[PDB]
């Protein structure tokens, strides 16, 4: 299995699935390192963020648990096709990158905070992470290159 992936059993159905502890991604199908990657992200901040403030809200008051619920909801809508990642990032990401539909550009290792970097370089091109925690809040990451 590729880096970070493990086989697991669904609680509701008992069917095998696959989970990546680095990206917190999960998928039913059996999954299939570059010097640089390009990623977009959607950040949801919370009251314990290092700077609980964004262009959306001067004082961010939601709890970390409420932020995780929002992230889970965005992931659901992206995976169902009801919304696309870029549209949700433009509207709801607590970050100046929202104006660029979440695009952070390309980077190598040594530039991003390690949890974000590790998830970014463990994703396949076009793959999306689960919730990824940094001191600023909770991210969804989309590897675009």
Residues near ligand A1ACH, by CB under 6 A:
41, 43, 95-97, 100, 104-105, 107, 111-113, 116, 134, 136
Considering the candidates 40, 49, 95, 97, report the single residue annotated as catalytic. Answer: 95
H or E stretch at 70: helix 64-80
Considering the candidates 46, 93, 129, 139, report the single residue annotated as catalytic. Answer: 139
**47 in active site:** no
As measured in angstroms, the least distance from the Cβ of 105 to ligand A1ACH is 5
Tokens 């999954």 found at: 31
d(CA 113, CA 116): 6
Considering the candidates 41, 49, 97, 120, report the single residue annotated as catalytic. Answer: 41
Residue 111 in tokens: 């530039």
Tokens 């964004």 found at: 54
- Number of DSSP helices (H) and strands (E) in the chain, helices first: 3, 7
**95 in active site:** yes
Give the nearer residue to ligand A1ACH in terms of CB position, either 17 or 38.
38
**41 in active site:** yes
**Paired strand residues for 36:** 108
Give the nearer residue to ligand A1ACH in terms of CB position, either 77 or 109.
109
Considering the candidates 97, 120, 129, 136, report the single residue annotated as catalytic. Answer: 136
Give the nearer residue to ligand A1ACH in terms of CB position, either 21 or 36.
36
**46 in active site:** no
Using CB positions, name the residue nearest to ligand A1ACH.
95
Q: Are 93 and 42 in contact (CB under 8 A)?
A: yes
Instruction: Determine whether 58 is exposed, middle or buried from the number of CB atoms within 10 Å of its CB (0-12, 13-18, 19+).
Output: exposed
So which residues are the catalytic ones? 41, 95, 113, 136, 139
């Amino acid at each position: 299995l590729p880096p970070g992936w493990e086989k697991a059993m669904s609680r509701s159905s008992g069917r095998v699935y696959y989970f990546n502890h680095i990206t917190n991604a999960s998928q039913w199908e059996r999954p299939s390192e570059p010097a640089r990657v390009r990623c977009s992200h959607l950040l949801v901040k919370h009251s314990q963020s290092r700077r609980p403030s964004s262009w959306r809200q001067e004082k961010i008051t939601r709890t970390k648990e409420e932020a995780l619920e929002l992230i889970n909801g965005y992931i659901q809508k992206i995976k169902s096709g009801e919304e696309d990642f870029e549209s949700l990032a433009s509207q709801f990401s607590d970050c100046s990158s929202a104006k660029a539909r979440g695009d952070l550009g390309a980077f190598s290792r040594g530039q991003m905070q390690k949890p974000f970097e590790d998830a970014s370089f463990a994703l396949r091109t076009g793959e999306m992470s689960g919730p990824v925690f940094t001191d600023s809040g909770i991210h969804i990451i989309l590897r675009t290159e």
